Structure formats: structure tokens, C-alpha cells
């Protein structure tokens, strides 16, 4: 029958329900369960594609379904190798489906934790692997900022790891369009976690590409800690005061000197003294693996 999915998503993003088969639960998303599946005929030149399936049930408020659909509309536009791709929507039935790119190794945070010595194919990353993760994440962020978007929520848990270990930005629920103004000021109650927020965001609810760079600094820290909680030993309220007044995370034990210096540049108190993601990628480009030049935003005509 007739519902929000008939109205809020263009019919040319539509994909037939019978081209979709669901296989198992992947995890809880922000609107419903996420599943793994196979899509017959949704990717270019590929007969079948393994996919992630997001659902919203018939028994979900119209309000949340509209939010689900709007959130999909935003992602529609993002086509970058380091951003998880939206492949289409199944609107003509129930439950409503959004078909995503499958990232077989899940979210970066719990992937990093799985690397801790406490699977023959899982070992703590070398400096070289960490640089790769860094450039790939920075690339996807360069891409966003270039299309005049602020993520507002960069963190390991919001990145995903592919089968070949490629890392991509994977959650966009909090992104804001900053064409024209170059900042987003939060009016009222916000739900972003304090331990990933810039000093200026904490103080005035201001968000820019600079505050995204701050968060990037924090995910570097997560990579170097195999995903420990930032500012452990402080409560959320103590993090707010610590970070707002210029406090910084300590260099992780055994952390490559290079990585920590990069964090320090990201954690400049004055947002304007931070590097851009383009500058970050530029400083480590010769350490990226060969395939980067053919797939990144960095070496694209867009850039
Ligand atoms: O692949 C995925 N793509 C998405 O767009 C997505 C969006 C929201 C949510 Br919640 C999940 C996904 C998604 C998830 N992939 C995903 C893949 C595997 C697993 C389970 N394994 C256990 C240890 C290694 C991994 C969990 C999540």
C-alpha cells in the first residue's frame, strides 16, 4: 500500500524487491536491524553483489520512516571510493529497504579491538597499515568537505572495514550542508559524544571542516590504541572541561612518533591552525599503496 517510501525517494533509485535476498543479521542500525544479502542487478557490470540491507518495518512511526528516507537521500549523492555507497532503495512493498555496500569486516572500532592479542588473519597494524587507514579516512573526509558537508561525527565506530581491509566513512546521520556559510551552529540539544568533539564545538556548538579535523586526530589515537576509550579516567563531564580548556590526549604507549605529531596538528586549539584533510593526505601520499591514485578523491579531477 501507500506510504512514505512512495513519496520521499525518487523512483529512479528504486530496485525490485525480488532482486533482493536476505541472509543474516549484521547488527542494529539507527532505524532497525541491518542484514546481509545478495542483490541481483544493482551494480555496474556485476550480475550479483553482496550487500548490506537496512530495514524499516511497517510497524515504525511515519516520522522515523521519513527520517530513514531523508537520511538515504543525503547519502545518494556521495560517490567516493572511501565512502560507503548507497546502491538503491526498495520502496514498493514492506518493509522499506535501503541497499548499502557490504563491508565484510564491520565497523572500524570493533575491528581494531579484534586485533588485540587477548584469528590467524588479524594482527596489530604496522605503521604502514596505519598510514593507509589514515589516508583512506582522510580522503573520504576531503571528499565530504569538498562537497561542502561537515560530518560532525567522525570516529572509528562510524567507519567500516572492507574485505580487502580498505577503510571507508560509513555513517552520515549527523552530516550538515555548509554551502554558503562554512559552519553549522547547533541550536539546542545535541547527541554527539563529548570525547570526539572539538573545543570550539564544546564551547559554542560550532562545526566546521576544522572540527572534523579535530575528530580525525581522535580516530588516529584510536588506531594507535586499538580503540581504547579516549580520556579514560575522566568522566564525560570532566572531558568537557579538560578539552574546552586546552587539554589533550597523551601520546599512546609505543605510538609511532609520526602519528602523534599528526594528532598534535589536528588538536591545535585555534581551529585555523589545523591542517586540512588535503594537507594531511599530501603529507603521507608517497606512503600510500599504489592503488590509491586510481581510486581516491585526492587524485581525481573533482579535486
Ligand atoms: O556492511 C555494512 N554496510 C553498511 O552500510 C552498514 C550500515 C549500518 C550498519 Br548498523 C551496518 C552496516 C554494514 C555492516 N557490516 C558488517 C559486516 C560483518 C559484521 C560481523 N563480523 C563480526 C566480526 C567481524 C565482522 C558486522 C557488520
From Swiss-Prot:
The modification Phosphotyrosine is found at residues 179, 183-184. Residues 2-303 are cytoplasmic. Residues 20-292 form the Protein kinase domain. It comes from the Eukaryota. Changing residue 299 to F: No effect on GRB10-binding. The modification Phosphoserine is found at residues 296, 300. ATP binds at residues 26-34, 54. There is a cross-link at residues 186, 189 (Glycyl lysine isopeptide (Lys-Gly) (interchain with G-Cter in ubiquitin)). Coiled coil: none annotated. The active site is at 153 (proton acceptor). This is Insulin-like growth factor 1 receptor beta chain. It comes from Homo sapiens.
Amino acid at each position: 500500500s501507500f506510504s512514505a517510501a512512495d513519496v520521499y525517494v525518487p523512483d529512479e533509485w528504486e530496485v525490485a524487491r525480488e532482486k533482493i535476498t536476505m541472509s543474516r543479521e549484521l547488527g542494529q542500525g539507527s532505524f532497525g536491524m541491518v542484514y546481509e544479502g545478495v542483490a541481483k542487478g544493482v551494480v555496474k557490470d556485476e550480475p550479483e553483489t553482496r550487500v548490506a540491507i537496512k530495514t524499516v518495518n511497517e510497524a515504525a512511526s511515519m516520522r522515523e520512516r521519513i527520517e530513514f528516507l531523508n537520511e538515504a537521500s543525503v547519502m545518494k549523492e556521495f560517490n567516493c571510493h572511501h565512502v560507503v555507497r548507497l546502491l538503491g532503495v526498495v520502496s514498493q512493498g514492506q518493509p522499506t529497504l535501503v541497499i548499502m555496500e557490504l563491508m565484510t569486516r564491520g565497523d572500524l572500532k570493533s575491528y581494531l579491538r579484534s586485533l588485540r592479542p587477548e584469528n590467524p588473519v588479524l594482527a596489530p597494524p604496522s605503521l604502514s597499515k596505519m598510514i593507509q587507514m589514515a589516508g583512506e579516512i582522510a580522503d573520504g573526509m576531503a571528499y565530504l568537505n569538498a562537497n561542502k558537508f561537515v560530518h560532525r561525527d567522525l570516529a572509528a565506530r562510524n567507519c567500516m572495514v572492507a574485505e580487502d581491509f580498505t577503510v571507508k566513512i560509513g555513517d552520515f546521520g549527523m552530516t550538515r550542508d555548509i554551502y554558503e556559510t562554512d559552519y553549522y551552529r547547533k541550536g539546542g540539544k545535541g547527541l554527539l559524544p563529548v570525547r570526539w568533539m572539538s573545543p570550539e564545538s564544546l564551547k559554542d556548538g560550532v562545526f566546521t571542516t576544522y572540527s572534523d579535523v579535530w575528530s580525525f586526530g581522535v580516530v588516529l589515537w584510536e588506531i594507535a590504541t586499538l580503540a581504547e576509550q579516549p580520556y579514560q579516567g575522566l568522566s564525560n563531564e570532566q572531558v568537557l572541561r579538560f578539552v574546552m580548556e586546552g587539554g589533550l590526549l597523551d601520546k599512546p604507549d609505543n605510538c609511532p612518533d609520526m602519528l602523534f605529531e599528526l594528532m598534535r596538528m589536528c588538536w591545535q586549539y585555534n581551529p585555523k591552525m589545523r591542517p586540512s584533510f588535503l594537507e594531511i593526505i599530501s603529507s603521507i601520499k608517497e606512503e600510500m599503496e599504489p592503488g590509491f591514485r586510481e581510486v581516491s578523491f585526492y587524485y581525481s579531477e573533482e579535486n
